[PDB]
């Protein structure tokens with residue numbers, strides 16, 4: 001039998017320290033092809049090892065297709081091939097798009113659904129998984145209005161995370177590194193920041209905030225580890241909740257939820273399953 005492995009790389013949709021992502025075509029169908037830099041080779045190995053352990057299949061997890069290693073003259077070429085989401089990342093989407101109540105809730109409940117699926121151990125199943133780099137650039141928007149979580153290059157089963165999204169216990173090096181629940185709680189902190197990024201873009205009473213990344217008003221454009229530690233750990237700052245949210249029942253409920261993701265004490269933070277339950281009882 002013929003094994004068609006040719007992928008036509010059509011356009012670069014992402015370039016960074018990690019390498020590149022391309023829209024490609026296989027057998028008439030869009031795929032996304034991540035080509036790894038030498039800097040980020042260990043992310044290909046980690047994600048490949050995870051999918052070799054458990055073939056994750058969930059509507060709110062970016063769909064795996066293949067891991068490819070190809071011998072070249074004096075290098076190894078590493079590709080991760082996934083489903084393609086033409087709307088691009090949540091970060092991208094929120095820059096020009098505003099949201100209504102329905103769209104805002106659909107986005108954040110879909111993210112909580114993906115994250116709870118990663119976190120939960122299933123017997124008979126899947127190991128529990130912590131993401132370790134959850135942020136709006138690692139979430140894709142689907143045409144049906146739900147999102148999916150991407151990039152399991154730093155994931156742990158039972159490179160550092162993006163500094164702007166690091167929890168206080170990562171910044172102050174108190175994280176209990178021999179407790180898997182510690183890594184779930186770091187993801188919940190980051191989830192609360194993503195929830196703040198999305199809620200800002202939800203219109204109420206003709207008002208919306210501009211897209212900004214978390215802590216935009218208190219750290220530099222490219223913040224250092226120390227910059228983040230001083231804000232989050234020493235001064236114990238949290239993202240601003242605008243007054244206009246307290247006129248809107250949805251944004252009032254979302255402000256309470258994000259506060260419960262941002263406790264200094266990691267064991268006080270909500271679980272992903274509790275976040276799901278709370279979201280299903282809003283609006």
Ligand SMILES: COc1cc(-c2cncc(-c3ccc(C4CCN(C)CC4)cc3)c2C)cc(OC)c1OC
Pocket residue numbers: 002003004005026065066067068081
């Ligand atoms: C090697 O590499 C790539 C392969 C493919 C691909 C292309 N056609 C057919 C296949 C296929 C799948 C499954 C079987 C089964 C049949 C039943 N039996 C119980 C075991 C074997 C056979 C063949 C594949 C996997 C695509 C690729 O890219 C999209 C590949 O490159 C990453």
Ligand SMILES: COc1cc(-c2cncc(-c3ccc(C4CCN(C)CC4)cc3)c2C)cc(OC)c1OC
Pocket residue numbers: 026065066
């Ligand atoms: C990697 O990705 C894609 C792969 C394929 C693809 C191509 N040839 C054959 C297969 C296949 C056939 C049969 C079995 C099973 C059936 C039951 N039992 C007997 C065990 C063996 C498995 C696999 C597939 C799945 C198509 C895709 O898209 C349409 C893929 O997605 C891009």
Ligand SMILES: COc1cc(-c2cncc(-c3ccc(C4CCN(C)CC4)cc3)c2C)cc(OC)c1OC
Pocket residue numbers: 013014021032033034080081082083084085086087088089092137138139140150151152
């Ligand atoms: C976060 O990480 C990964 C993401 C992806 C991925 C999957 N579907 C679609 C995309 C994409 C497509 C198109 C645009 C643009 C095109 C220009 N227009 C003006 C706005 C939209 C952006 C993004 C990506 C980047 C795949 C990955 O692996 C193969 C990723 O890494 C795990």
